[PDB]
Amino acid sequence: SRLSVAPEMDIMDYCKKEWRGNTQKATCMKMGYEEVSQKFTSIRRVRGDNYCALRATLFQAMSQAVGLPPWLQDPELMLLPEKLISKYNWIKQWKLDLVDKIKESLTLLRKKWAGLAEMRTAEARQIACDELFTNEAEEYSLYEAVKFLMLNRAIELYNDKEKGKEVPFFSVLLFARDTSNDPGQLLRNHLNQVGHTGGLEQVEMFLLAYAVRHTIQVYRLSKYNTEEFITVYPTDPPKDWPVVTLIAEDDRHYNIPVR
Template identity: 45%
Template sequence: MACLPSDTEWLVSKETKEIKNIPEKLQSRYGLIEGWSFPDVCKQTSGIKDDVALLKHHLSLLQKWWRAAAASPGLEGRRRLCDQLFQGGEDEFGVMEALKLLMLTCAVELHDIMQRGRDVPIFCWLLFSRYTSSCPRTFLANHLSRVGFSGGMGQVEMCLLGYTLHHTIKVYRLYMANMKEFIVTHYPDNHIQDWPSVCLVTEDGRHYDVAVGDPVCLREDFSGGPH
């Protein structure tokens, strides 16, 4: 697998140099971190009992692996790095929890913008119109905290993930193969031209895989956009 994007600008910019302080800020301002659901391997392996401290540790892991991916030579180098990461241990689960934390941070910021009556991406209205996620707290409790445990991510969460990472997630939906205009979906779809993209494949709209192998020249492009 080589699904870690190589662009690290969003992780090392001036605004994100204090990335490790995110858990403390979310806890002190909103009380969102206390009681975070962690995979058992995270607390058992790290020995860190405090939720804020553990999430700060996971953010450090994310930065370490992301920067290593950016420094890896080409696609094959990133693929080997990802093979090292995705072994089911603390680093893999810690990186996933860090990504969920960044998604929550983005959701909080977007919700605050909505509350002030300013423009937000369309998916935000869908995200916060559900009775199960009318605000960041209920979004965390009813949706985000279950990702990786008893649930996955719906389309609106995929939009939030892409928006959080400043990457377009391009999904080839194989179960829609007979409807060419619907086979490819972008999450979100408003930065297709100016954000890097990550491609996934799904056979049922619930389980997603990263296509691995040498690129091939397709006879027909269903993306509706430039190659």
């Protein structure tokens, strides 16, 4: 198999392989998988490279797509690269002209999502999504598109904040980080490193959820004995956003639980 989202396996078999022995840590993880297993029987292991949060979220979102969301239907989505890059010249510091590259990635994300949404059965969609996630250039193009949508949302949120408009508090937290005080520091110090030298930070999972308009419900196994045992990104989303559920043993890497 050439898949970057492994074939599914029983979640309890997965836990028994991964977490052996009697350490406090191992017991904590075992309780965490037992919690997940109340709702999900199986798990797909997501390739653990620096794109794993994007892979896990997109794979789940696209495999479950029965519609094309309005944000991907909106013709302005295709116009964004030119509008942003022309306005904000520092976007050309993007670590992969650039406008045509981004527009090709957005076009691919739109077309692949539309194609899944129209398939006549859930099995056809599973087959097609498995084919899409096989570590070929199409898969990494999708991540370029989602990183770019994260940057666009970050720019809007930053600009709302400056105009004194109301913004979700996670964006105050995002721009409070000393390496991320504005959108260009976000790009150079964070987004450019995503998929290259590190994965998304906790506060960026809120930005990811906003970028693709999905509610991301994560079982945080390292937080099991606390109220963050599950955290939902964002905390109070539109009731109309689809939900994707992930598991993260330690906020670094995400896998996909399967019902």
